[PDB]
UniProtKB/Swiss-Prot annotation, chains A, B:
<dbReference type="GO" id="GO:0140651">
    <property type="term" value="P:futile creatine cycle"/>
</dbReference>
<dbReference type="GO" id="GO:0005739">
    <property type="term" value="C:mitochondrion"/>
</dbReference>
<dbReference type="InterPro" id="IPR022413">
    <property type="entry name" value="ATP-guanido_PTrfase_N"/>
</dbReference>
<feature type="modified residue" description="Phosphothreonine">
    <location>
        <position position="317"/>
    </location>
</feature>
<dbReference type="GO" id="GO:0031625">
    <property type="term" value="F:ubiquitin protein ligase binding"/>
</dbReference>
<comment type="function">
    <text>Reversibly catalyzes the transfer of phosphate between ATP and various phosphogens (e.g. creatine phosphate). Creatine kinase isoenzymes play a central role in energy transduction in tissues with large, fluctuating energy demands, such as skeletal muscle, heart, brain and spermatozoa. Acts as a key regulator of adaptive thermogenesis as part of the futile creatine cycle: localizes to the mitochondria of thermogenic fat cells and acts by mediating phosphorylation of creatine to initiate a futile cycle of creatine phosphorylation and dephosphorylation.</text>
</comment>
<keyword id="KW-0597">Phosphoprotein</keyword>
<keyword id="KW-0808">Transferase</keyword>
<feature type="binding site">
    <location>
        <position position="67"/>
    </location>
    <ligand>
        <name>creatine</name>
    </ligand>
</feature>
<feature type="modified residue" description="3'-nitrotyrosine">
    <location>
        <position position="264"/>
    </location>
</feature>
<dbReference type="GO" id="GO:0046314">
    <property type="term" value="P:phosphocreatine biosynthetic process"/>
</dbReference>
<feature type="binding site">
    <location>
        <position position="330"/>
    </location>
    <ligand>
        <name>ATP</name>
    </ligand>
</feature>
<feature type="cross-link" description="Glycyl lysine isopeptide (Lys-Gly) (interchain with G-Cter in ubiquitin)">
    <location>
        <position position="96"/>
    </location>
</feature>
<dbReference type="Pfam" id="PF00217">
    <property type="entry name" value="ATP-gua_Ptrans"/>
</dbReference>
<feature type="modified residue" description="Phosphoserine">
    <location>
        <position position="194"/>
    </location>
</feature>
<dbReference type="GO" id="GO:0005615">
    <property type="term" value="C:extracellular space"/>
</dbReference>
<dbReference type="GO" id="GO:0005524">
    <property type="term" value="F:ATP binding"/>
</dbReference>
Length: 376, 376
């Protein structure tokens, strides 16, 4: 109806001015593609203008190119595939429209990874996101859908016991004390301040139906209705990535089984893996990483390059840890789609091991050139 | 609340005794203005008492006229504008509340200054400072904020390349000899001995989250978290001020670009230019100068007159808190607001040549007074 009104205007009159923009959406949205897709709509009523709104509002930057678009439901990726495919291929370094994504949530396929030198790895974690099929994604979901998702999530999470026994914390009723504890634990999320997220409409009705759940041992954490229906995180001190990944896989499996009993399932397909709001999170939507002490390597000229070759990413940290050590970094896999969860965790395990060997060499004041890896 | 307690005492009982003080703050702070602004506070909690403490604690300075107050966050200049505006006007030769700041980082607009006499100018340097919006300034920032700033600065600076490729050296990671070596060679900020630094609260937690980043040749350097979040410096031996300035403009613009790509912006506004801790560093926050041998002029009557005439300030060989040794004076532009960066460097280039002229004649007994220029 509203779209019907826009259709009365020539396509070029509604076409966004992206002359100063720098995001994936802007790169692919040609005057032709816009005229071609602007009349389309998903069953929930999500249109091309809805998909690209955030990319129009947020120009992005030359160096850091943002995605500039979001899916509003599972059908968005199909209906507007001519937009998403090029963006997906570009963002995930060559992932073709015909490629297949393999999912592997079997910890036993992981080789080693249970002994990352604790003298360097302070903590390990693996996180992902999931969408419940049948409901619209955060940018487009109604208060009703969101509340239904929250109910489904809470039921399941409250059924978990033993190692995964825990409790739910609704943001709405959260006390100052709970809020602080969660903040000290790095388990809290607030209303997004990022315009990329705000412009998509995902922050509507905040904090209605949003919540945080974590097990009593504080090694398993779930965020409900934030960027995606569910955000799942497994973590713990030390470098036992295998243990962290095992809890990750077990937790996801149990939750899924709980959903299936009520006839619900995660959004997933052979091409895009698990479906999520932002194209950059498709496939495994998995980020496996470690907080690692690398005071020597961190100050080395080829640090960023080595990470790149190992297909890893880094971020500095701002805690007392890096202050005392003089170089603690948050390192994780860079890939998301076209690699299974196992292969992704494997690259972090393998990558970290080499990082540690280099750090030790540097400690001894030796060279690390012979240890340099080739781009993987 | 502490301020609430103090508000229980009449304003006259809390009013500081500035009878033996000689700083800009002292020239403006009246009992009336104090009573009017003492109940105010910024979102961060910075109060008038916090703003003026250093000026109450420090009646004067052995080498320069001091401001006597500091800003604790970007909002300080607005909430306490009735204090700052008069000071800013006095410190920056008449800059009024209605005036506008102009920027000009175009090296090409600088004429000459590429060959200041090497027999006089030992080295040329151009520096400025930048504040990251959203964080409190050094007088008030928490250990957490300061650590966050260092984190952001290190990741950004690690992207510079070419002649600007560099490395970060955390203060806490240098040996005692390494730190003093950099200080004595005029590259690193001195130890927290400054009277302003101590009294304003900027020495807290030292040396936590403080450090210096610089390229291989140490011709482009960045101080992290000293008196300002960032102090960008370009320097080299000799008198080729133009090359120093060109490198300065280049590096500076790349730095801003890198921060923008991360959704961060420097504190700035049309009126005050770039926002820094000390009002004396507003606008361009630029201090361009040379280390110059002037044994004659140094011990001359109207030397301070020629400098005040040329809008130039003199400092010791080791900085503002030091005296000139071996006849080597630090001569730089005095004002920073109301003039563009190019105009500022131009005044230093033109000024130096007049200084060398006066020197060349004083060394020939031809004590000249005709060279005396008109105050610009
Ligand atoms: N022209 C110059 N050449 C070399 N070193 C300089 C020059 N100017 C300043 N320095 C050095 O910079 C340091 C800081 O001095 P200060 O007076 O505080 O300057 P600023 O405020 O600009 O940083 C000192 O160590 C000083 O020796
Ligand atoms: C107090 N000072 C010195 C300084 O800020 O470094 C002034 N320039 N007013
Ligand atoms: Mg200084």
């Amino acid at each position: 109806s509203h779209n019907a009104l826009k259709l009365r205007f020539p396509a070029e009159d509604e076409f966004p001015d992206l002359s100063a923009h720098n995001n994936h959406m802007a790169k692919v949205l040609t005057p032709e593609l816009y005229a071609e897709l602007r009349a389309k709509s998903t069953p929930s009523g999500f249109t091309l203008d809805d998909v690209i709104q955030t990319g129009v509002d947020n120009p992005g930057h030359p160096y850091i190119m943002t995605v500039g678009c979001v899916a509003g439901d599972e059908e968005s990726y199909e209906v507007f595939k001519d937009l998403f495919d090029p963006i997906i291929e570009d963002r995930h370094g060559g992932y073709k429209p015909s490629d297949e994504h393999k999912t592997d949530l079997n910890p036993d396929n992981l080789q080693g990874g249970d002994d990352l030198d604790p003298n360097y790895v302070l903590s390990s974690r693996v996180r992902t996101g999931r969408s419940i099929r049948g409901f619209c994604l955060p940018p487009h979901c109604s208060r009703g859908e969101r509340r239904a998702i929250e109910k489904l999530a809470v039921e399941a999470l409250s059924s978990l016991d033993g190692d995964l026994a825990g409790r739910y914390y609704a943001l709405k009723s959260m006390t100052e004390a709970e809020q602080q504890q969660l903040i000290d634990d790095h388990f809290l999320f607030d209303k997004p301040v990022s315009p990329l997220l705000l412009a998509s409409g995902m922050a509507r009705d905040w904090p209605d139906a949003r919540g945080i759940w974590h097990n009593d041992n504080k090694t398993f954490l779930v965020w409900v209705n934030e960027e995606d229906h569910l955000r799942v995180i497994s973590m713990q001190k030390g470098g036992n990535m295998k243990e962290v990944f095992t809890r990750f896989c077990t937790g996801l499996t149990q939750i899924e089984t709980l959903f299936k009993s009520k006839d619900y399932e995660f959004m997933w397909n052979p091409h895009l893996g698990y479906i999520l709001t932002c194209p950059s999170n498709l496939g495994t939507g998995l980020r496996a990483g470690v907080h690692i002490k690398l005071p020597n390597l961190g100050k080395h000229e080829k640090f960023s390059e080595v990470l790149k070759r190992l297909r890893l990413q880094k971020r500095g940290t701002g805690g007392v840890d890096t202050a005392a050590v003089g170089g603690v970094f948050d390192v994780s896999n860079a890939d998301r789609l076209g690699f299974s969860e196992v292969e992704l965790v494997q690259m972090v395990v393998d990558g970290v091991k080499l990082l540690i060997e280099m750090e030790q060499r540097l400690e001894q004041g030796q060279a690390i050139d012979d240890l340099m890896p080739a781009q993987k």
